[PDB]
Design a binder for this molecule. Structure first.
Ligand SMILES: Nc1nc2c(ncn2[C@@H]2O[C@H](COP(=O)(O)OP(=O)(O)O)[C@@H](O)[C@H]2O)c(=O)[nH]1
Ligand SMILES: [Mg+2]
Length: 263
């Protein structure tokens, strides 16, 4: 019943706002200077299904002049959870339920530059997708027009293919034809053009999360405004269990194979 998300990206990309946008979404009838990793856990529920959701907010990388090996604090934390799960699994006397602190999905925030992936993003995504499920998003997508979001999305998809970045949902995990059709529609939308908002607003008799601009409000849970519902339903509803299966059966097993061979 445990599910762990981690937001990863440069500072000023709306990551902390996105953590609050998830934890206060209207899908649920239940309302609820950083320099280290901070995990926020809330045992949420939707329609009679209890879920212990944990979202780990990360400090900003890429803000320094020298950002070489800035991925190691994140890659080190992910491997720590694999190592702790492995040590609990190899004990002679084990716990009846091993606590699952492994990251089941990483949400990587791409700056809305409108150009393409930067060398920093490529190096981070290449090493992240090797050990964890990664779903990239176009951060603060409202800073780009609808036509610019689509063109920027396509160029990123081209960068992911040229640099061999297998992003969730990985095409090598679609067995059923129904999965091949549903996931192909998702990969066409990744990276999601997301917009975050932790502020509520009264919009004609409805309470909604949104960003207040000059000529209206950007309802973040409205598909006609942004693609946050696509990211939200993937993580919480449609692909929650599949993310946990791939984390356990693929990523953790790969870590286990390496550790037991070098031992
Ligand atoms: N245009 C736009 N601005 C946003 C969005 N989300 C957050 N912001 C703004 O970005 C600023 C910093 O956001 P924050 O969540 O702290 O970014 P973080 O450093 O990655 O955690 C805030 O002033 C927010 O108002 C968004 O979806 N669109
Ligand atoms: Mg933040």
């Amino acid at each position: 019943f445990e599910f762990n998300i981690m937001v990863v990206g440069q500072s000023g990309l709306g990551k902390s706002t996105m953590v609050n946008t998830l934890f206060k979404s209207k899908v649920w009838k239940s309302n609820p200077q950083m320099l280290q990793l901070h995990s926020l856990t809330h045992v949420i529920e939707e329609k009679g299904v209890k879920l212990k959701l944990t979202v780990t907010d990360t400090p900003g990388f890429g803000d320094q002049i020298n950002n070489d090996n800035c991925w190691d604090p994140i890659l080190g934390y992910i491997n720590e959870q694999y190592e702790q799960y492995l040590q609990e699994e190899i004990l002679i006397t084990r716990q009846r339920h091993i606590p699952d602190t492994r990251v089941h999905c990483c949400v990587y925030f791409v700056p809305p530059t409108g150009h393409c992936l930067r060398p920093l993003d490529i190096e981070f995504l290449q090493r992240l997708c090797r050990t964890v499920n990664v779903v990239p998003v176009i951060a603060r997508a409202d800073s780009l027009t609808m036509e610019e979001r689509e063109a920027f999305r396509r160029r990123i998809q081209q960068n992911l293919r040229t640099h061999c970045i297998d992003v969730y949902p990985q095409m090598c995990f679609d067995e059923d034809i129904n999965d091949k059709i549903l996931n192909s529609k998702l990969r066409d939308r990744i990276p999601f053009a997301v917009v975050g908002a932790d502020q509520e607003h009264l919009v004609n008799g409805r309470c909604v999360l949104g960003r207040k601009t000059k000529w209206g409000i950007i309802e973040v849970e409205n598909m006609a405004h942004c693609e946050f519902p696509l990211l939200r339903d993937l993580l919480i509803r449609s692909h929650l269990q599949d993310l946990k299966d791939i984390t356990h059966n693929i990523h953790y097993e790969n870590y286990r194979v390496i550790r037991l061979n070098e031992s």
